[PDB]
Design an enzyme around this catalytic site. Structure first.
Site, short mmCIF file in Angstrom:
data_model
loop_
_atom_site.label_atom_id
_atom_site.label_comp_id
_atom_site.label_asym_id
_atom_site.label_seq_id
_atom_site.Cartn_x
_atom_site.Cartn_y
_atom_site.Cartn_z
N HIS A 1 10.37 35.80 27.19
CA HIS A 1 9.08 35.44 27.33
C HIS A 1 8.52 36.31 28.60
O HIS A 1 7.24 36.46 28.51
CB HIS A 1 9.09 33.86 28.32
CG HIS A 1 10.05 34.07 29.32
ND1 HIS A 1 11.56 33.50 29.30
CD2 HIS A 1 10.02 34.03 30.57
CE1 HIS A 1 12.02 33.62 30.45
NE2 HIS A 1 11.08 33.94 31.35
N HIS B 1 9.83 40.86 37.68
CA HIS B 1 9.47 40.86 36.59
C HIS B 1 7.72 40.57 36.45
O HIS B 1 7.16 40.53 37.53
CB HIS B 1 9.82 39.40 35.72
CG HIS B 1 9.53 38.32 36.58
ND1 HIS B 1 10.17 37.94 37.40
CD2 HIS B 1 8.34 37.54 36.41
CE1 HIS B 1 9.70 36.84 37.87
NE2 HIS B 1 8.55 36.48 37.41
N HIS C 1 6.23 39.72 40.17
CA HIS C 1 6.85 38.87 41.23
C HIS C 1 8.25 39.56 41.32
O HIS C 1 9.14 39.88 40.62
CB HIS C 1 7.17 37.52 40.47
CG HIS C 1 6.07 36.61 40.17
ND1 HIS C 1 5.89 35.78 39.29
CD2 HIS C 1 4.93 36.70 40.83
CE1 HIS C 1 4.76 35.00 39.51
NE2 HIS C 1 4.01 35.84 40.51
N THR D 1 8.40 29.11 35.92
CA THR D 1 8.91 29.08 34.76
C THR D 1 9.98 28.09 34.83
O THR D 1 10.58 27.58 36.02
CB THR D 1 9.67 30.27 34.14
OG1 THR D 1 10.81 30.52 34.73
CG2 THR D 1 8.74 31.65 34.17
#
Ligand code: I7B
Ligand code: ZN
EC number: 4.2.1.1
Length: 257
Positions: free
Chosen positions: A62, A92, A117, A197
């Site tokens: 992702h 990421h 992040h 997430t």
């Protein structure tokens, strides 16, 4: 039918496997700059990345994670709204298919091209796995990315993406200095939130910097060349891997300035 960012497995579907998706402290959120209140009780933010040691970069299906060796007291985030010390474990990004979108947090509804992040875990919990089960287990430093001048410190990340195009691929990524991804000012907004997430655990103290860093169109374009799919599978460009703003509910965003 793993979670993702598509029409049938995207953010609006996550609540089925992860009920906390409709929780009381979900992230990201829109930061209303006029409602955010300056908090004089906030101590100076301390980012100490001088001894940070990266191990490698991974395409997780992702997005991609640049992982660090967090077995020793190195790369620490403290001060600000934080009590104790948080250790850097990985960073990421979240980005869009177009420059007009991509960030998770928004400022007065403004969407940036992407968002970085830097994830840190509270050392009082021993490790990341135990930390995410605590209300103050993580501290994520969020930095907005806008398209303009290139960010030299990001190029090494951009150039290695060709080697991890598909899901599951990883590659050695040592000696990368995250200090080259930080803006001049450490002015920030902070609030209690969650992972953006799945599993969407509500264990994060969010620290979002007000000043965005500028990256070139060419740099973000290379982010968009990555694949959501694995090697040998139909190509699905890795774009728009961002979760939209969630209800602020019973929370107040504090400003350090
Ligand atoms: N592991 C992890 C931890 C945090 Cl805290 C975040 S985020 N987006 O909330 O910063 C994202 C991830 S993931 N699944 O993308 O690697
Ligand atoms: Zn993230």
């Amino acid at each position: 039918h793993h979670w993702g960012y598509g029409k049938h497995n995207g953010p609006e579907h996550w609540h089925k496997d992860f009920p906390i998706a409709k929780g009381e402290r979900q992230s990201p959120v829109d930061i209303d700059t006029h409602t955010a209140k300056y908090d004089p009780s906030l101590k100076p933010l301390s980012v100490s990345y001088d001894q940070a040691t990266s191990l490698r970069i991974l395409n997780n299906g992702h997005a991609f994670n640049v992982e660090f060796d967090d077995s020793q007291d190195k790369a620490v985030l403290k001060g600000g709204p934080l009590d104790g010390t948080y250790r850097l474990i990985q960073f990421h990004f979240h980005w869009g298919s177009l420059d007009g979108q991509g960030s998770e947090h928004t400022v007065d509804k403004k969407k940036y091209a992407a968002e970085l992040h830097l994830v840190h875990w509270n050392t009082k919990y021993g490790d990341f796995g135990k930390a995410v089960q605590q209300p103050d287990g993580l501290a994520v430093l969020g930095i907005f990315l806008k398209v303009g001048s290139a960010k030299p410190g990001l190029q090494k990340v951009v150039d290695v993406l060709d080697s991890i195009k598909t899901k599951g691929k990883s590659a050695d990524f040592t000696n990368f200095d995250p200090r080259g991804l930080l803006p001049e000012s450490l002015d920030y907004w902070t609030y209690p939130g969650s992972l953006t997430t799945p599993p969407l655990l509500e264990c994060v103290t969010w620290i979002v910097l007000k000043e965005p860093i500028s990256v070139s169109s060419e740099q973000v374009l290379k982010f968009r060349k990555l694949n959501f799919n694995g090697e040998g599978e139909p190509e699905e460009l890795m774009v728009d891997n961002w979760r939209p703003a969630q209800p602020l509910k019973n929370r107040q965003i504090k400003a350090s300035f």
